[PDB]
């Protein structure tokens, strides 16, 4: 079934003793080596709950958005997931007024679409300097909006890869009544988050596996078979 253990070799570890007591429900023993260790039963239960909710929202057949701003490995990873799973994405700093307001950026997305259709029509209908300037404008617009172009209504569900650095996004999500799941690193506020995933995310060795698992969970909506959680082959990891 699900919730395999052996392959998931690195799932713990966190910055030097900055944990908050609100995560003490997940730290049963006492650790002497300036780190943390979770319990496998709780994280398997959280993974099952997350799988249930993502399959529910896949049966909803709505729209999903991913966000990410920390270390570029997660950025390129979620880019891959975006080109493995048809979903909007953001590769730069999260923009305020994105989920607490729609028109403010819907007009901008419509302007980007206008530029796209202009480029589709225009092949030799512009001068040299203006052509390069408009290409640069397209690049600047897609720097924040390139992934997020398939949304025509307020999104039904997103995820959070890091509750700490993107506290703005989780706060805006909590302002609205729509939910969101978060890869909850320890010391984060659990009251803001509605579905908690207690696993390491600061390190990439766990973030890649978690991202792949959630992509496989959401990939069933397309009648496109899953990749991991049932394959005995180990995942890849390369850093230097």
């Amino acid at each position: 079934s699900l919730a395999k253990l052996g392959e998931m070799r690195t799932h713990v570890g966190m910055v030097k003793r900055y944990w908050n007591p609100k995560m003490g429900f997940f730290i049963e023993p006492e650790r002497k080596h300036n780190n943390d260790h979770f319990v496998l039963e709780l994280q398997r239960q959280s993974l099952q709950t997350a799988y249930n909710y993502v399959k529910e929202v896949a049966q909803n057949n709505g729209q999903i958005l991913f966000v990410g701003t920390k270390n570029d490995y997660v950025k390129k990873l979620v880019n891959n997931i975006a080109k493995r799973v048809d979903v909007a994405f953001i590769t730069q700093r999260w923009l305020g007024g994105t989920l607490t307001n729609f028109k403010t950026l819907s007009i901008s997305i419509n302007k980007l679409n206008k530029l796209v259709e202009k480029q589709a029509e225009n092949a030799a209908d512009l001068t040299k300097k203006e052509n390069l300037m408009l290409s640069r404008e397209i690049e600047r617009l897609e720097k924040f909006f390139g992934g997020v172009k398939s949304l025509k209504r307020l999104p039904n569900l997103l995820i959070v890869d890091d509750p700490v650095y993107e506290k703005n996004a989780v706060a805006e999500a909590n302002i609205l009544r729509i939910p969101v799941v978060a890869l909850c690193n320890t010391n984060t506020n659990p009251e803001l988050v509605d579905f908690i995933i207690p696993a390491n995310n600061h390190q990439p060795q766990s973030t890649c596996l978690l991202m792949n698992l959630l992509a496989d969970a959401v990939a069933e909506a397309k009648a496109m078979p899953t990749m991991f959680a049932y394959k005995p082959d180990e995942e890849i990891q390369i850093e230097i």
Binding site: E56, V57, N60
Partner: peptide, 5 residues
């Protein structure tokens, strides 16, 4: 509310 379906 877990029952949007």
């Amino acid at each position: 509310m877990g029952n949007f379906d």
